[PDB]
C-alpha cells in the first residue's frame, strides 16, 4: 500500500544551507516516491545538490532562494500501478 506520513507541506530552510524536503510515505517496498515540480522529475537529472534519502525525503544541498516554491511528492508503485501524491511548499 502507500500511506503519506510526516510531510509538513509549507517548509522553510536557509539560503545556501543543506536542506531536506520532509515527505514520509509508507509505500509497499520495491517502488518509491517521485519528486516533481521545481526541476521536472529530479530523480532523472540527479543534480550535484539533490540526494533523496531512504525515508523518501529530498536533501537539496545549499537550497538556493530561486529553487523554492512547491515540490510535488508522487508515491508510485509499478507492480500494483499506484500513483498517490501531494504538493509540498518549500521556502528559502
The answer to whether 37 is annotated as binding is yes
Q: Is 38 annotated as a binding residue?
A: yes
Contact 11, 90 (CB under 8 A): yes
Q: Which of 45, 38, 24, 25 is nearest to 70 (CA)?
A: 38
CA–chain centroid gap for 85, Å, is: 10
Question: Got the DSSP string for the chain?
Answer: -EEEES--SSEE--TTEEEEE--EEEE-SSSEEEEESSSSSHHHH--TTEEE-TTS-EEEEE--TTS-EEEEEEEEETTTTEEEEEEEEEE-
> Which CA distances in Å does 25 have to 22, 36, 55, 56?
10, 15, 8, 7
What cell was used for 75? 508515491
The domains of the chain, with CATH numbers, are 1-92 (2.60.40.10)
48 is in an annotated binding site: yes
Determine if residue 72 is labeled as part of a ligand binding site: no
Technique used = NMR
Residue 81 is assigned to a ligand binding site: no
Shortest CA distance to 42 belongs to which of 59, 29, 66? 59
**Pairing label, strands 11-12, 50-52:** unpaired
Per the CB < 8 A criterion, the answer to whether 25 and 4 are in contact is: yes
Is 46 annotated as ligand-binding?
yes
Amino acid at each position: 500500500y502507500v500511506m503519506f506520513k510526516n510531510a509538513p507541506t509549507p517548509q522553510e530552510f536557509k539560503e545556501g544551507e543543506d536542506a531536506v524536503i520532509v515527505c514520509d510515505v509508507v509505500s509497499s517496498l520495491p517502488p518509491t516516491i517521485i519528486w516533481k515540480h521545481k526541476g521536472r522529475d529530479v530523480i532523472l537529472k540527479k543534480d550535484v545538490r539533490f540526494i533523496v534519502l531512504s525515508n523518501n525525503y529530498l536533501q537539496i544541498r545549499g537550497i538556493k532562494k530561486t529553487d523554492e516554491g512547491t515540490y510535488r511528492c508522487e508515491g508510485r508503485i509499478l507492480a500494483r500501478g499506484e500513483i498517490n501524491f501531494k504538493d509540498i511548499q518549500v521556502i528559502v
